[PDB]
Design a protein around this ligand. Structure first.
Ligand SMILES: NC(=O)c1ccc[n+]([C@@H]2O[C@H](COP(=O)([O-])OP(=O)(O)OC[C@H]3O[C@@H](n4cnc5c(N)ncnc54)[C@H](O)[C@@H]3O)[C@@H](O)[C@H]2O)c1
Ligand SMILES: NC(=O)c1ccc[n+]([C@@H]2O[C@H](COP(=O)([O-])OP(=O)(O)OC[C@H]3O[C@@H](n4cnc5c(N)ncnc54)[C@H](O)[C@@H]3O)[C@@H](O)[C@H]2O)c1
Ligand SMILES: NC(=O)c1ccc[n+]([C@@H]2O[C@H](COP(=O)([O-])OP(=O)(O)OC[C@H]3O[C@@H](n4cnc5c(N)ncnc54)[C@H](O)[C@@H]3O)[C@@H](O)[C@H]2O)c1
Ligand SMILES: NC(=O)c1ccc[n+]([C@@H]2O[C@H](COP(=O)([O-])OP(=O)(O)OC[C@H]3O[C@@H](n4cnc5c(N)ncnc54)[C@H](O)[C@@H]3O)[C@@H](O)[C@H]2O)c1
Lengths: 267, 267, 267, 267
């Protein structure tokens, strides 16, 4: 197994279409022992994760909660056993209030809303590294989920801005993590049909935004030399696992693109 | 004159070493009629700007103040005269609480501090465009000040993250501005010895941070094929003026580097 | 005038739709005194340039000819007068054999053809700098024409590869030029309907390539926040002039995008 | 094993310090069945590769030889057995005549020399893909070796230009390879003390170039958050193997950096 013997914390599961659900599944398939964290709806998350190939402890983590973050390392240690540390950490957490996305004008997002989204989507990558690095082994790996923000695009609006901050945060986390012998990287994924993504295509954030995201997805598959299947999160789960393994040991502060090769092609 | 007949709003003057002071001076030298905005210490700013080659109205603008932003367009119109619009806008505003910079550990910056810095340094670029676009002429130009955040670096910490967000904001502002026939760009400048920069070199944010910033500056000049003079803001003021002129009419959502060519050289 | 008193060498005029024709026209409009170089069809080029607002000496320059390059500085000095030097140099030269473009398979371009195209399109930027730097004044500016090659695209094939090499050459030329107090930069332009471009849209390199280039152009204008007019080379001529002026004095080894802002927008 | 059952062609072994020697070793350690290609000194290469953990057929391949390339697919099929195809291809080939590197002035490299280096170092990536794609399985992977050319640097000169072309070639190869269900990527490695690299540090290309390369290496390790060991090629061999595996299945036309994280850090 690719991750035999590794202890890995996976955040961000909320449904069975969550990217983190598939990261967790593939990780277990490859021999990893997991600890999960979940936000708010813990009964739902437990029920969802019962479907994973192996059992895994579920800890509550609201990334905006200082107390949750302060106690996290202790709770993880309790879950995996004193004297054991984590080898891997997956950050698969993102959020932006509706005012910062969709057909709501870019200029009309109130800073308080933008700031909440940047807190959850970018700052929390640093918050989690701070909480967990003291309990990680040398050779460890921290991975977060990215959506390539190097160009602006319709609809994504302030979430794209938050991803830009996240990529910058990642390079700083790499500096800190390096002192523990730990890597920090992002996986920039193509669009994936999660429940939220489907809602948006279905017009949940405005018809115009729905149409733009649908077009975005179609152009993505078209220019990807090996195609892109927005209904299949497995290729991104495998990529996250590659970064958690020992097979990219000299890569840190970096971004790995699991996007079908769309970002390197113009037409 | 390069800017003959143009009406230009310049924010960000606080002392005579402010980059915006030099932007304003060169702009006036090239025929621009200016409106200035200042934060907090208005008597100081008025006294400082009395030294500019021509007179210019000074309006108060706290970029975190909704009321200031809501009234800004009216106050500018009053200052330049009904029926006249702006041709140019300069955003030269940046701030990050001390906890987000220097030898204070990256992980120890509290989100409230980071969020204030991102508000002032990144979000406010959008806030100003929102306030001013309704009073800009086609062919107009909005320019903000950037410090290349594509790589992480010691000491700059969360301010670098804020610049990353700003570059992302700029690309979105370009989309909105385009509808008014207005461009939006950033000038990424080399390090400039402002009062704050001198304080930091002098150890104001920790000796270790001071030493790193001093080394950063020295390597900058070394690899710049035409050198870099951190004591001379004129080359960046000229670059900002180039973007306010009619001579880069097909450039928008972009970053122009006024850095001596340091960023394109490795050693 | 923007270029009052400047002596500028402009290569690359072959017809009145040549980008270099418009660079030359705008430069003269702004007070520059020009020396032109032309390849092969000198009688045609003289006849074409008679239409420029002012007269300008025409020197022959085949960029693949060592003798032409060896004698170039002397011939320019003769044309502008002993004791005078150039302030500006415009490289607007590009070529790729048909086998390296269009519907001819990428893999089927013979190296001899690719190498000719890279010689003319990339290496010659260095060849010209070598020839002319000894006769340039401090504060001088060398500018070449680029087409953004950071992503692959249909039809452009090996010409895109040649532009990639050119951008790399430019950064090295900046290093050498810096020793003379001279800048070196590229202008990455949007697609322009030159005679060759029209021929290709018209199917000259295959119907499939024609269709792709036409689609490329249409998407370009669509995502450009201020639009893109492929029939109007003036916005790029103005940008080249901005780089030849004294208004971007701290930019070197760099790329300025005159593309309507298309490259910074995804959809 | 990571590459159990995979048939992989590895070019570029010339000594036991060759990066390709270590790629081949790790690949065999992970269950790959190899076919090797070698240039010129075949007796030397056979003797060197006898030290690999398993036996592997050695085919001659001069990448500038049309006949070698024309017959390559047949010779590989003969070596691995009719009805079997390759799952992987490693391009670890690079060369630049001395005139294009070191203290020899950048401007003094004759085009014939530059063109030879670009032929071997960049064009041949396409030559090999053309030869081998007809004998690759869906899900296959082509990998080439890169040295990050995004910024200019002392000494590397025209080899850096050749790497720039190579990165561009890679994106085009991805387009062609995609039609076979095959990926194409580069690994951008940190500096590695091969025999040639040691010779250069030792002054083989000029004392000034030796000093610059030594400084380059030292700064590399310094800014790498997890360090860089130029004497250890294993971390890059592992990275190449990661790309040959099934664990980055949605990455193509891309560059993976195995550089200790040096390129994402400024100081
Ligand atoms: N779906 C896509 O097209 C796509 C593409 C690229 C990257 N991503 C990124 O992948 C990551 C996972 O998103 P997803 O698409 O799987 O959506 P998702 O809704 O399934 O998962 C997002 C998770 O973030 C959690 N979260 C929100 N606020 C939180 C907080 N305060 N504390 C802790 N957790 C919180 C939610 O509970 C949820 O579990 C996100 O960072 C997203 O931006 C998604
Ligand atoms: N100095 C450098 O090395 C350097 C390099 C690149 C970019 N920059 C950028 O240039 C810009 C100008 O900075 P500077 O170096 O001239 O420093 P400065 O201190 O002279 O100017 C910063 C200005 O921002 C203003 N400001 C802070 N909070 C504000 C708020 N709430 N509302 C309105 N204004 C507010 C201050 O009053 C001050 O006038 C900044 O964006 C800075 O990041 C500086
Ligand atoms: N047209 C576009 O869409 C576009 C877009 C971006 C960049 N560019 C670049 O702009 C530059 C000018 O091209 P253009 O579009 O004006 O086409 P053009 O045909 O009008 O000009 C190209 C010039 O290169 C010259 N040339 C070819 N081989 C030469 C050699 N051996 N020695 C000297 N000169 C030689 C030709 O004589 C011609 O004058 C080229 O580098 C081109 O790649 C063009
Ligand atoms: N050593 C480094 O610091 C470093 C760093 C990054 C990337 N790289 C790249 O890694 C690759 C391998 O280089 P290396 O460092 O292992 O050096 P090396 O000398 O060990 O290997 C280079 C190989 O290229 C082969 N070659 C040269 N001309 C050829 C031709 N005509 N046909 C077929 N093969 C030919 C040589 O025989 C040799 O086997 C190169 O592409 C190099 O640029 C090296």
């Amino acid at each position: 197994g690719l991750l035999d013997g590794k202890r890995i914390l996976v955040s961000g599961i909320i449904t069975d279409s969550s990217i983190a659900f598939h990261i967790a599944r593939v990780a277990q398939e490859q021999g990893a022992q997991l600890v999960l964290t979940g936000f708010d709806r813990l009964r739902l998350i437990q029920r969802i994760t019962d479907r994973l190939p192996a059992k895994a402890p579920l800890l509550e983590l609201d990334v905006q909660n200082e107390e949750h973050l302060a106690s996290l390392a202790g709770r993880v240690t309790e879950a995996i056993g004193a004297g054991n540390k984590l080898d891997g950490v997956v950050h698969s957490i993102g959020f932006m209030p509706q005012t910062g996305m969709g057909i709501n004008p870019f200029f009309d997002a109130p800073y308080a809303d933008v700031s909440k989204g940047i807190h959850i989507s970018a700052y929390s990558y640093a918050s989690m590294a701070k909480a967990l690095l003291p309990i990680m082994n040398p050779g460890g790996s921290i991975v977060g989920m990215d959506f390539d923000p190097s160009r602006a695009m319709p609809a994504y609006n302030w979430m794209t801005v938050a991803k830009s901050a996240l990529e910058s945060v990642n390079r700083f986390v790499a500096r800190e993590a390096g002192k523990y012998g730990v890597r920090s990287n992002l996986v920039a994924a193509g669009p994936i049909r999660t429940l939220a993504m489907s809602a948006i295509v279905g017009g949940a954030l405005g018809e115009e935004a729905g149409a733009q995201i649908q077009l975005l997805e179609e152009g993505w598959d078209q220019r990807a030399p090996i195609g892109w299947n927005m209904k299949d999160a497995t290729p991104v789960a495998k990529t996250v696992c590659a970064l958690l393994s020992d097979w990219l040991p000299a890569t840190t502060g970096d971004i790995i693109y699991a996007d079908g090769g769309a970002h390197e092609q113009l037409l």
